[PDB]
C-alpha cells in the first residue's frame, strides 16, 4: 500500500494538496521509494467492503486506486565506459581537468574545489597486523564570512557523491546526529536508528552550520571522528556501530566576521580536540 500526495508545485494558490491510496501487487512492489514523483495508470474504485452500513451518520464511501503501471516522472558502468575511463586517465593534466569540473555554478575558490576533490576521492585505509588502524577518509573544514557559497558547495557534494547524508546543528533536517531507540509511528514497533554518521558509513556526511551545535551533537561528532564507531546503551540494547565516513563541515567565525589579527583557534568557538581531527 502506497499513499500519493499532490505535488506541491502544481497546487493553485490558496488551496491544499490532496492525497489518495494506491495498491501495488506482484512485481510492482518496492519499485518507487519515498520522495520521488511518479505517474500511475490504474483503476479507480470504491472500498466496496467499507466496514458496514450500521454506522451512524451520512452514507459516505472511501475510494482507492488499483495500480496497473507505475513509472518515474546511476553509477554502474560497462566495458565501453571502462575503456573511455582508461583513455581519459592516460591524458596529461587530468587532475586539473577534474578540478575544473567541480561546482561549475560557483566562481573561483580553486583551493576549496581541490580540497573537495581530495576529500571526495579519499585515500586507502591501512591496518598493521590487525592491531594498528590508520583511517583513509579526508576531512575538510570551511570557515568563511557570510555570502560565500559554502552551502552551495555542500549541496553540490550531496548531489554528486554516491552516498552523501545531510545534517545540521540548527534547522529542519531529515535526520539527527545521535543514535536512539524510537517508536515507529505506523507499525508501533521499537526501532534502533543511528545518526547521519552511522547512516553514511563508507560515504560522506555533510554538516551545515557546524558551530551552532549542542553538547550531545558535539559529543557524537567527537566520538565518530576519533574512533569511527558509535557506542549505544539504551532500552536494554548494548552495542557498537561502524561510522567510517568522511566529514565536510561549514561554520562561521565569532561575531560573524573573521579577525585576521588573531589565530584561527580564537576566531571560532570549537575546541582543539575537534579542530585537530
Amino acid at each position: 500500500r502506497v499513499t500519493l500526495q499532490e505535488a506541491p508545485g502544481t497546487v493553485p494558490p490558496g488551496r491544499l494538496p490532496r492525497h489518495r491510496e494506491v495498491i501495488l501487487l506482484a512485481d510492482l512492489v518496492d519499485v518507487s521509494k519515498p520522495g520521488e514523483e511518479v505517474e500511475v495508470t490504474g483503476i479507480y474504485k470504491n472500498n466496496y467492503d467499507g466496514n458496514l452500513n450500521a454506522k451512524n451518520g451520512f452514507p459516505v464511501f472511501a475510494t482507492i486506486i488499483e495500480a496497473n503501471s507505475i513509472k518515474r516522472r546511476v553509477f554502474s558502468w560497462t566495458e565501453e565506459e571502462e575503456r573511455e575511463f582508461r583513455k581519459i586517465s592516460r591524458d596529461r593534466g587530468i587532475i586539473d581537468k577534474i578540478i575544473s569540473s567541480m561546482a561549475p555554478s560557483i566562481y573561483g575558490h580553486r583551493d576549496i574545489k581541490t580540497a573537495v576533490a581530495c576529500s571526495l576521492f579519499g585515500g586507502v585505509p591501512k591496518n598493521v597486523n590487525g592491531k594498528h588502524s590508520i583511517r583513509g577518509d579526508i576531512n575538510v573544514l570551511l570557515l568563511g564570512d557570510p555570502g560565500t557559497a559554502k552551502s552551495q558547495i555542500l549541496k553540490y557534494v550531496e548531489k554528486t557523491a554516491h552516498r552523501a547524508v545531510f545534517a545540521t546543528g540548527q534547522g529542519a533536517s531529515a535526520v539527527g546526529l545521535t543514535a536512539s531507540v524510537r517508536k515507529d509511528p505506523i507499525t508501533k514497533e521499537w526501532t534502533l536508528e543511528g545518526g547521519a554518521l552511522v547512516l553514511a558509513d563508507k560515504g560522506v556526511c555533510l554538516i551545515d552550520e557546524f558551530d551552532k551545535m549542542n553538547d550531545q551533537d558535539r559529543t557524537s561528532i567527537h566520538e565518530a571522528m576519533e574512533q569511527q564507531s558509535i557506542s549505544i546503551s539504551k532500552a536494554g540494547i548494548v552495542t557498537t556501530l561502524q561510522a567510517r565516513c568522511s566529514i565536510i563541515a561549514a561554520a562561521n567565525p565569532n561575531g560573524g566576521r573573521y579577525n585576521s589579527t588573531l589565530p584561527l583557534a580564537q576566531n571560532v568557538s570549537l575546541t582543539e580536540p575537534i579542530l585537530s581531527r
Binding site: 546503551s233 536494554g236 540494547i237 548494548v238
Partner: protein
C-alpha cells in the same frame, strides 16, 4: 474416598514426627501460649529438609519433586498430632538446603513446574489486602432458622478438583426471603506481590525478569516494596492456555505463579531491612562479663577499623553515635532529639571514605549517599506515584528509609541550598513535611548523620581562621553535634610507623561487637543524675563565657549535645544512670573536638 497411598504417606510422616521430637514440643508451646494469652499465634511450624533427607530419602525426594502428592498427607498428620496432643488446620514451612531447587527469576524455567522452589529477589510492588469470602450465613424471617453455604476456588489447594460453582443464596428452599449475617459470615485475607531479580546480580544493560506470588491468611503483610526477599513456594500453572474452545490466538501460554508458603526478608547493604541476631545465653554471659572491666570503652573504641592508624577520638565518636542516646516526649506533645551527628573535614588522604564505608558495613541499618548522587526528591521522599486504583501516594526516599538508622554522606560540601534547607528539618525536627497536589502528610525520619567534606583550598591552612577554610553556613554547622578537623603533617617517625603498619596489613570481632551494640541499644535506658547536671552546667557556662576561638559556634544545642554524649556513654557502661565519669568523658571529648 479413603486412599491407601494417602494413608501410608500419612503414617510415614507420623513416624517422622515421632522420631523427631522438637516439632511436637513446638506445637505444644504454640497451643500453651494461645490458651494462656486468652493476641493469638497462628498454626504453622517449620520443618528441616536436611532432617527429612537423613530420615527418609525417598520421602524427601517426593516432597521436593512432587509436592502435590506428598505435602497434604504431612499437613493432615500434623493436624492429627496437634488434635491428639491438645487437652483450624495446621501448616508447614520449609528451611534447609534446596540444592538445585534454589533459583532466581531469570533461571526459573518450565522444567521446574509443579516443583517446590526457593527464589530470591527484590519486592517491586505489593497489592492491597482484601478479604475473601469463605462461608456465608443467612437468617429466615418466616421460619426463624439459620442457613449457610461454603465457597472455594482453584488456588486454595494443590490438587486439581472438579469445579463446583455454587451461587449466592437469596431465597429459601420454599421461597422465603433471606437476610445476610455479616457478623457471622467468615472472611480471609489475600494478597499478591511481584518479585524481581536483584540489581546487584542481574546482568548490566539487560531488562529484568519477574514472577508473581500469592499469599493468604497470616502471610499477608510481611514485606514492603523495595525489600530483599527469599520466598519458598510451589511453582504452579493454572487454567487452560487457550486450549478450550476455539481461541484462535496462539501467542499466549499458560498462566503461572507461586503459591508461596514461606517468606523471609534478607538484610543487605544500603537496604531498608534492619539486621538482627539471635542472642544465646553464652553471648549474654560474655557481654555481661565484659561489661565489668574498666577499659571497656577503650577496647571497644580500638576494635573498630583496626586497619586504619590513629583517629582514636573519631573512633570513640563513631561508637558513641552507634550506641546513641535517649529521646524524650512530654505529655504536652513536644519532642526532644536524642540522636548524634558527625562531620569530618580533613586533608584529601586521611581515610575519611574508609571510615565512612566501615560504618556503612557495620551499622545494622545504614544508607550511603554522595554529594550530587542523590538530589531533590531522592532524599526527602517527596516523589508522588499512583496505581491503577486511581489514588496517589508517596514512596519513601533515602532519609525516610533511614528511619531509626544511619545516613552516610560522602562529598558533603557539593550539595546545594535547595536540599540543605530540606536536611535542616531532618537533623533538628527529625521529620519531613510534604504538601503537593492532593497530598499533605508528615513522615517520621528519626535518623543520625555522618558526613565528610574537603577544605576550600585543597589542604587545610593554619594561617587562616576556620571560617575561611570550612565555608559552610553557621546555622548548618550548629546542627552537627561534633565536628573534627584532620590534617597530615609530615614527620619522620610518624611516617615510619604508618609505613610498618600498612606493610603489616598488606600481608573483639565484628559479629560480637554487633551483638553487643544490639543488646545495649535494646535493653538499657539510663536516667540523669544531679552530679552530671552540675558538671554539665559548669562546663557549658565555661565554654559559653570563654574567649578562645573555636571551630564552631555555641548554642543550647551544645548543652543538649553534652546531655546526649553523657547518656550514650552511660549506655555503653550498661548502667541505669549517668555518672560524673561519663559527664567528664563527654566534656573532654567535646573540648578536644573544639580545640
Amino acid at each position: 474416598a479413603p486412599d491407601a497411598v494417602f494413608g501410608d504417606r500419612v503414617r510415614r510422616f507420623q513416624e517422622f514426627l515421632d522420631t523427631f521430637t522438637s516439632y511436637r514440643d513446638s506445637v505444644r508451646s504454640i497451643q500453651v501460649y494461645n490458651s494462656n494469652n486468652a493476641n493469638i499465634l497462628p498454626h504453622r511450624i517449620i520443618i528441616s529438609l536436611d532432617d527429612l533427607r537423613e530420615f527418609d530419602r525417598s520421602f524427601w525426594s517426593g516432597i521436593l519433586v512432587e509436592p502435590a502428592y506428598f505435602i497434604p498427607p504431612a499437613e493432615k498428620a500434623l493436624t492429627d498430632l496437634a488434635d491428639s496432643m491438645d487437652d483450624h488446620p495446621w501448616k508447614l514451612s520449609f528451611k534447609g538446603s534446596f540444592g538445585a531447587h534454589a533459583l532466581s527469576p531469570r533461571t526459573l524455567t518450565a522444567q521446574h513446574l509443579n516443583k517446590l522452589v526457593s527464589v530470591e529477589g527484590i519486592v517491586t510492588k505489593t497489592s492491597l489486602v482484601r478479604p475473601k469470602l469463605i462461608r456465608s450465613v443467612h437468617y429466615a424471617a418466616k421460619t426463624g432458622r439459620f442457613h449457610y453455604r461454603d465457597y472455594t476456588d482453584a488456588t486454595t489447594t494443590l490438587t486439581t478438583r472438579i469445579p463446583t460453582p455454587a451461587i449466592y443464596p437469596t431465597e429459601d428452599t420454599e421461597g422465603n426471603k433471606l437476610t445476610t449475617e455479616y457478623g457471622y459470615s467468615t472472611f480471609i485475607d489475600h494478597q499478591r506481590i511481584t518479585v524481581q531479580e536483584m540489581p546487584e546480580m542481574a546482568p548490566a544493560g539487560q531488562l529484568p525478569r519477574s514472577i508473581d506470588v500469592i499469599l493468604d491468611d497470616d502471610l499477608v503483610d510481611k514485606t514492603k516494596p523495595g525489600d530483599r526477599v527469599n520466598v519458598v513456594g510451589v511453582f504452579k500453572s493454572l487454567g487452560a492456555g487457550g486450549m478450550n474452545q476455539s481461541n484462535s490466538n496462539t501467542l499466549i501460554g499458560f498462566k503461572t505463579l507461586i503459591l508461596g508458603n514461606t517468606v523471609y526478608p534478607l538484610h543487605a547493604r544500603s537496604t531498608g531491612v534492619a539486621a538482627r541476631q539471635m542472642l544465646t545465653d553464652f553471648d549474654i554471659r560474655n557481654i555481661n562479663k565484659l561489661s565489668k572491666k574498666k577499659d571497656i570503652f577503650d577496647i571497644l573504641s580500638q576494635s573498630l577499623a583496626p586497619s586504619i592508624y590513629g583517629h582514636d577520638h573519631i573512633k570513640k565518636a563513631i561508637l558513641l553515635m552507634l550506641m546513641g542516646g535517649v529521646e524524650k516526649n512530654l505529655e504536652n506533645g513536644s519532642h526532644l532529639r536524642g540522636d548524634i551527628n558527625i562531620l569530618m573535614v580533613g586533608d584529601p588522604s586521611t581515610a575519611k571514605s574508609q571510615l565512612l564505608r566501615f560504618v556503612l558495613n557495620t551499622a545494622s541499618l545504614a544508607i550511603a549517599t554522595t554529594g550530587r548522587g542523590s538530589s531533590g526528591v531522592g532524599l526527602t521522599a517527596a516523589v508522588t506515584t499512583d496505581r491503577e486504583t486511581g489514588e496517589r501516594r508517596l514512596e519513601a526516599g533515602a532519609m525516610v528509609l533511614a528511619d531509626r538508622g544511619v545516613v552516610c554522606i560522602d562529598e558533603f560540601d557539593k550539595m546545594t541550598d535547595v536540599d540543605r534547607v530540606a536536611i535542616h528539618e531532618v537533623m533538628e525536627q527529625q521529620t519531613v513535611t510534604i504538601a503537593k497536589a492532593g497530598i499533605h502528610t508528615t513522615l517520621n525520619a528519626r535518623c543520625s548523620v555522618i558526613a565528610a567534606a574537603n577544605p576550600v583550598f585543597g589542604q587545610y591552612d593554619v594561617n587562616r581562621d576556620p571560617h575561611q577554610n570550612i565555608a559552610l553556613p553557621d546555622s548548618l554547622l550548629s546542627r552537627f553535634d561534633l565536628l573534627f578537623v584532620v590534617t597530615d603533617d609530615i614527620n619522620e617517625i610518624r611516617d615510619r610507623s604508618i609505613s610498618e603498619h600498612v606493610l603489616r596489613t598488606h600481608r573483639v570481632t565484628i559479629p560480637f561487637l554487633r551483638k553487643y551494640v544490639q543488646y545495649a541499644k535494646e535493653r538499657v535506658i539510663p536516667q540523669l543524675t544531679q552530679e552530671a547536671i552540675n558538671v554539665i552546667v559548669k562546663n557549658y557556662t565555661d565554654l559559653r563565657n570563654d574567649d578562645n576561638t573555636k571551630k564552631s559556634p555555641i548554642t543550647a544545642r551544645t548543652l543538649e549535645t553534652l546531655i546526649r554524649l553523657a547518656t550514650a556513654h552511660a549506655k555503653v557502661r550498661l548502667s541505669k544512670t549517668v555518672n560524673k565519669v561519663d559527664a567528664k568523658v563527654a566534656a573532654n571529648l567535646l573540648r578536644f573536638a573544639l580545640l
